[PDB]
Amino acid sequence: IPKHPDSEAVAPDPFNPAATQLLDDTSWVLSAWKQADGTARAVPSADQGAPITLTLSTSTGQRHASGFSGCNRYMGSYALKDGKLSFGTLGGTRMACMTPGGQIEGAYLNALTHIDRTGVQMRAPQQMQLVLDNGDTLTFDRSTR
């Protein structure tokens, strides 16, 4: 039990809202998911065989998100407002990968319905960060190819 660290931090918080209006032709990969209190969940790292990716583009001709979330691909529409990324009716298909990083599709979609906060740093090295209405947190890398 050393001391407290003392106070050596006076500055504004990271990310910026004048960035969540460029979230249209971008792509990002989820690498960590924290719970609202701070429990780092377990997620499929890219070494594990089916990482969690997101792609935003006019890939259908329309503003349609796509990606691989768990071991099942997802899709659906989106919209930009309030410094956040709202989604429409998302969904995917019920394939089976018998894995903890597979079934997490269910949880992941349940976190696309609650976008009450949103972090993006378009400053390189770019890492987006979604936040839920509970306070839960999802750290994404940018992935441009």
Domain boundaries, the chain: 18-145
Cβ atoms within 10 Å, residue 118: 20
Dihedral sign, CA of 41, 22, 112, 133? Answer: positive
Q: Give the distance, in angstroms, between the CA of residue 51 and the centroid of all CA atoms in the same chain.
A: 13
Continuous segment of H or E residues that includes residue 105: helix 105-110
Q: Identify whether the C-beta of residue 62 lies closer than 8 Å to the C-beta of residue 77.
A: yes
Query: What is the C-alpha separation between 48 and 63, in angstroms, rounded?
Result: 30
- Whether 131 contacts 116, CB under 8 Å: yes
Rounded to whole angstroms, what are the CA distances from 98 to 88, 111, 143? 28, 21, 27
Instruction: Return the structure tokens found at 78.
Output: 């989106």
DSSP letter (8 states) at residue 11: -
Residue 99 is classified by DSSP as S
CATH number of 18-145: 2.40.128.270
Maximum alpha-carbon separation in the chain: 59
